[PDB]
């Protein structure tokens, strides 16, 4: 969607969380505020948007 028309999603249990996105693109920014990017897998993020 466009920058003004940015979307929103309410992820809640389906397949797998991460370690897949760690290559989805050859080069991609992974700026994380708070949670450490390397510690993103075994946490439990309750209310998450996309």
């Amino acid at each position, epitope marked *: 969607a466009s920058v003004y028309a940015w979307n929103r999603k309410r992820i809640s249990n389906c397949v797998a969380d991460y370690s897949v996105l*760690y290559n989805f693109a*050859p*080069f991609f*920014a*992974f*700026k*994380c505020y708070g949670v450490s*990017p390397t510690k993103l897998n075994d946490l439990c993020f309750t209310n998450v948007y996309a």
Partner: nanobody
Amino acid sequence: SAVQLQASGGGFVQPGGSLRLSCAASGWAETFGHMGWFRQAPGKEREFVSAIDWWDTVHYYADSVKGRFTISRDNSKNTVYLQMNSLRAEDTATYYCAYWDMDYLQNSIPVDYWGQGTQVTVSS
């Protein structure tokens, strides 16, 4: 951050010759830092050469490389070049394609990521 760098090029340049290098980038990073080269003169300390902004808004040059160095990023394959004009005969060094993983370079000494050394001698 975990960033892999893909540098290639070099050869055997001559007094008054030139280089046209390349340095591709791949890997997730905390921020979009600047690519470039930290060349140590043979037996010397690692020295900043010429840094381009990731958005291609800031260019940098140094006296040891002014007039005979320039850095530019490929818009197609995202491989930042090191293309120059009339490089002198003293640059018989090994050139590391270092990686400042910061959006702005307050000082060049803290170089989060680095690259491979490019050993090019300058003689005919």
